[PDB]
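Exercise (ungraded).
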Amino acid sequence: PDIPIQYELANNIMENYQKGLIPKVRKGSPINVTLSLQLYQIIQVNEPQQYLLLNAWAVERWVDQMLGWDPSEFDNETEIMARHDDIWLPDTTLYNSLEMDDSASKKLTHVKLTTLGKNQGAMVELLYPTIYKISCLLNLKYFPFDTQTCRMTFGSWSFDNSLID
Amino acid sequence: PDIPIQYELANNIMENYQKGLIPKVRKGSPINVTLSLQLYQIIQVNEPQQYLLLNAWAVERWVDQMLGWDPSEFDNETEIMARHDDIWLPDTTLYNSLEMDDSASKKLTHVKLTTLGKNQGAMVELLYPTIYKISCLLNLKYFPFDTQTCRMTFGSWSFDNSLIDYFPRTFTNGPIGLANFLENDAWSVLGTKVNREEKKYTCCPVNYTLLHYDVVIQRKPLYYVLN
Ligand SMILES: *[C@@H]1O[C@H](CO)[C@@H](O[C@@H]2O[C@H](CO)[C@@H](O)[C@H](O)[C@H]2NC(C)=O)[C@H](O)[C@H]1NC(C)=O
Ligand SMILES: *[C@@H]1O[C@H](CO)[C@@H](O)[C@H](O)[C@H]1NC(C)=O
Ligand SMILES: *[C@@H]1O[C@H](CO)[C@@H](O)[C@H](O)[C@H]1NC(C)=O
């Protein structure tokens, strides 16, 4: 009554959660993660050290099978915002990266949860800006009329596709 | 039933564990650690400051004698993933390193545990990328036709070989993997070597193990000759 409904909703959905382990309740299927990228700037191209610096926005979407709730029980609420430290997140990694510290190349603040049912889980969306230091081989044979192609590789560092896809 | 089996498995295996101390249950033998390295890039060679910058991947394997479980009790599960902060890890150190902060030269995320039995422990594997700042002496007498050799020394900073032992793991083409190496525009790699040595403390009658990795690089003088 005199407290936000978000307090009760978070207390209800955060009761039995353990963020240190993957929330896989169904044995048959893995967890599907969808990734999209938007390019905003090309900061620097370094030929002697063979790396490329980019500024981009990344969006990841997946379904958490342990964070579902019934909207009718909570004043018909179908959305909530939680800190990224509270819930489990997939380990999306750039394989050919020249930066070892994630605090200088990423910024995670919040995630959005949309319920799918009491026993169906919730949809999790994570959007954050990032700066990528990508190491790519450069061919300077036709300088200054040269064109370059650098590849970005994304995936899971420790989980096989039977767990995260 | 309505919770992941990983929850129960982690709660079972994490009950009596203390990550701040070495998990040595058997008195007779030490803990063996196997290390392998793969080279990906040569970022910079600095002659005035006498250091070399490399980008490499490191894999370490050992057996933890306190993290065993019976697969049949947990829905026939034989593997699990845990954060590196939860369990004990050996202190593998590069002796001739010019970097004091490990957050800018290493990135540890997760470890993989494979059970060997309820009372036999589990096999732990740790893979992570790293950037090494190696200080090596450079001889510029034959510049620009010079070749250099810098050594990498690995071992335990505080534990003698009666507690932690180190062994090298080599690849098909040599001790250091070069199948995914990125070609440098100024240096070429000729070969690699590995050597395992036991060294004596100069205050105590105990030994410790050191691993020596040798990399031979040769300069390309075409730019200087033509310029
Ligand atoms: C510690 O390392 C030294 C390395 O010298 C070992 O010394 C060897 O000892 C054996 C006999 O135990 C000799 O046959 C070898 O010739 C010695 N090595 C050399 C290079 O001379 C020593 O055994 C190791 N273990 C200890 C001291 O407990
Ligand atoms: C949503 O739930 C609230 C419960 O507080 C109820 O008063 C309201 O009528 C519901 N609206 C709809 C459209 O179901
Ligand atoms: C593995 O253990 C499970 C226990 O849930 C059992 O149902 C299954 O038959 C076992 N399979 C084998 C091959 O032992």
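Further reading is listed at the end of the chapter. For now, observe: Residues 41 and 182 of chain B are 5 Å apart (CA to CA). Residues B 198, 200, 207 surround ligand 1 (CB under 6 Å).
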